[PDB]
């Protein structure tokens, strides 16, 4: 029933080991900015359109731009075929990412504008929502969308009493907790943070420190991604 026997996870990793992560920028032709990301079993395509004027003027918001990130799962991305189109979960994911992205995008520079972020998961492991957001910042910089920082994040949680990093789909479903967090690396400010399960204050802070340590390495993988492209 249990995930570890020799302090080894089902896939052979230690507790604070990331699963392998790749990011390639500028892979779409139509999109203004783009990013393909591979994070363990996750395969996620992100495209960015904008910033441009909103039509019709009804939905217009007139202080700043609006970040409309739309999170969609392909029908063949999950264990069983799922019917295409958004559901309650994907709307919540679209909001929580739209909100986090709004903190780094310099939204005030484009009043009445719209910025589209399409996150198309083609194949989903656990932690999907950070994987797109981490790829999203790359697309945004690939599109020239002004940001004050490159958002980055990671998951953590408790599996059999041990706090582990970047949980897999199995550890997510049957583990004791899951904590997805995304931060602004300059300041360490949290722009996305959720938590499911059962955890003590002490374990919760341990999990945070482990996530903050991993984002240093992921943010470099983001840097490289933009680097090669030009």
């Amino acid at each position: 029933k249990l995930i570890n026997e020799d302090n080894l996870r089902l896939d052979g990793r230690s507790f604070n080991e990331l699963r392998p992560i790749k990011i390639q920028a500028g892979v779409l032709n139509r999109a203004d900015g783009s990013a393909y990301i591979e994070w363990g079993g996750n395969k996620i395509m992100v495209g960015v359109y904008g910033p441009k004027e909103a039509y019709p003027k009804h939905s217009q918001d007139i202080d700043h731009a609006i970040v409309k990130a739309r999170y969609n799962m392909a029908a063949f991305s999950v264990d069983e075929r799922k019917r295409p189109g958004p559901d309650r979960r994907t709307m919540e994911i679209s909001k929580v990412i739209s909100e986090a992205l709004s903190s780094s995008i310099m939204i005030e520079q484009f009043p009445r504008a719209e910025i589209d972020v399409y996150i198309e998961v083609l194949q989903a492991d656990a932690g999907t929502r950070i994987a797109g957001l981490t790829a999203a910042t790359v697309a945004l910089a690939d599109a020239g969308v002004p940001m004050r920082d490159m958002v980055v994040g990671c998951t953590a949680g408790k599996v059999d009493g041990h706090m582990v990093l970047d949980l897999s789909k199995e550890e997510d479903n049957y583990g004791e907790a899951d904590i997805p967090i995304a931060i602004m690396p300059k300041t360490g400010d949290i722009v996305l943070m959720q938590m499911d399960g059962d955890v003590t204050e002490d374990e919760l802070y341990q999990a945070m420190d482990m996530i903050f340590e991993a984002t240093k390495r992921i943010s470099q993988i983001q840097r490289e991604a933009l680097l090669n492209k030009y």
Binding site: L28, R30, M45, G47, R70, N72, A75, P84, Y118, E120
Partner: peptide, 14 residues
């Protein structure tokens, strides 16, 4: 069979 025209694919999509 089902073919999805994802909004990522074209500016005018959605």
């Amino acid at each position: 069979t089902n073919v999805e025209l994802l909004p990522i694919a074209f500016p005018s999509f959605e």
